[PDB]
């Protein structure tokens, strides 16, 4: 079992930020990171979500995918353990 994923961030002028993933439940892995939105030209990409921490099964979400644009989003950090 695993915690709900963050919303994706969407596209526009910035792209909007990923989600943070979730925490699991007690017994579940984390949720994943949402992926942030993509920027129009000239515009910066959104940073992915940081993923969610687990709930002790020691397996984090990913961090989201940043988006691209001028300049693209970093991605987000892994969920703790």
Not at 31 to 47: D, L, Y
Not at 54 to 59: E, F, M, Q, R
Request: aromatic fraction near 0%.
């Amino acid at each position: 079992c695993k915690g709900a994923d963050g919303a994706h961030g969407v596209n526009g002028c910035p792209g909007t930020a990923g989600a943070a993933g979730s925490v699991g439940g007690p017994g579940c892995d984390g949720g994943h990171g949402g992926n942030g939105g993509n920027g129009n030209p000239g515009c910066a990409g959104g940073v992915g979500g940081a993923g969610g921490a687990s709930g002790g099964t020691g397996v984090g979400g990913r961090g989201g995918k940043g988006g691209s644009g001028t300049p693209k989003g970093a991605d987000g950090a892994p969920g703790a353990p």
